[PDB]
Structure formats: structure tokens, C-alpha cells
Amino acid sequence: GLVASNLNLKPGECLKVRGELAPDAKSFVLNLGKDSNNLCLHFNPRFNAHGDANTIVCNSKDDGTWGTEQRETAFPFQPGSITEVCITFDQADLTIKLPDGHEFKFPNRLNMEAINYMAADGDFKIKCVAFE
Numbered sequence: 001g002l003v004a005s006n007l008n009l010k011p012g013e014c015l016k017v018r019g020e021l022a023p024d025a026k027s028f029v030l031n032l033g034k035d036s037n038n039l040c041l042h043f044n045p046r047f048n049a050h051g052d053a054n055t056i057v058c059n060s061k062d063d064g065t066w067g068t069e070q071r072e073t074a075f076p077f078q079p080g081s082i083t084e085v086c087i088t089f090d091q092a093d094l095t096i097k098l099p100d101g102h103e104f105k106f107p108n109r110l111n112m113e114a115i116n117y118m119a120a121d122g123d124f125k126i127k128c129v130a131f132e
């Protein structure tokens, strides 16, 4: 999966990620934080994996150890198609904005004020990445 560092997202900025889901997508990932072991956001929508179907699982990682899981019922994704996710942030929390219109929030537990790391994983092939 594609890894990008140094991208310094400051509060208020919007990171748009666009890509295509594999035809038999089981799940894909999007990690944001300071480094691979310090993620303020772990965006793991699961079509079918770990005992979960059509459910988005969010979390944070501190020095390698996971935090409390927060699950979202909304799931506007389909295998073998192209989608995008818009993510914004501030001291409060991050705001994930799904392609189907609605968005939900996830608390900025690690309390960081600058995303610098990003990593995609799973059955998701990135085609575009914008910083608006």
C-alpha cells in the first residue's frame, strides 16, 4: 500500500483520497498520524473481515497499542468500483466525509495538531490524492 510522509496537514485543511476497490474487496485501510505507530485515525471499513460485514471500524494507535474501537453503521461502498474519502481535522476531532454525502466524527485522542503520515492498505488502489 502507498505510504506518504511529510505531508503536513494543519487543522482546517482537507485531504481527499480517491481510489478503486478490488472486485472482491474484503476490507481496506487508511492510516493517518505521525508515523506507523502513532495514528490519530485508523479508517478500516470492512466489507467482510474479522467477523464484521459492511461496517466501518475506526480507532487510534499510541506507540503501537490500539485504542478503543468506534464502529459506524453507514457503509456506502461497493466492490470493484471507484470511491473517495474526504478527511478534515481540528483539535476537537477528525471528520470523515463519505462519498454518499454524510459524515461522522472521531475524537482526536492523541491530541496532535498536524497529520504528517498517511498509509493505504487492503483492497484499495489509490488513483488520486489531493490537499485542498
Ligand SMILES: OC[C@H]1O[C@@H](O[C@H]2[C@H](O)[C@@H](O)[C@H](O)O[C@@H]2CO)[C@H](O)[C@@H](O)[C@H]1O
Pocket: 042, 044, 050, 057, 058, 059, 066, 067, 069
Ligand atoms: O481496532 C483497530 C484494529 O483492529 C484489529 O482487529 C481487532 C479486532 O477488531 C478486535 O475485535 C480484536 O479483539 O482485536 C483485534 C486486534 O488485533 C484489526 O486487525 C486492524 O486492522 C485494526 O482495524
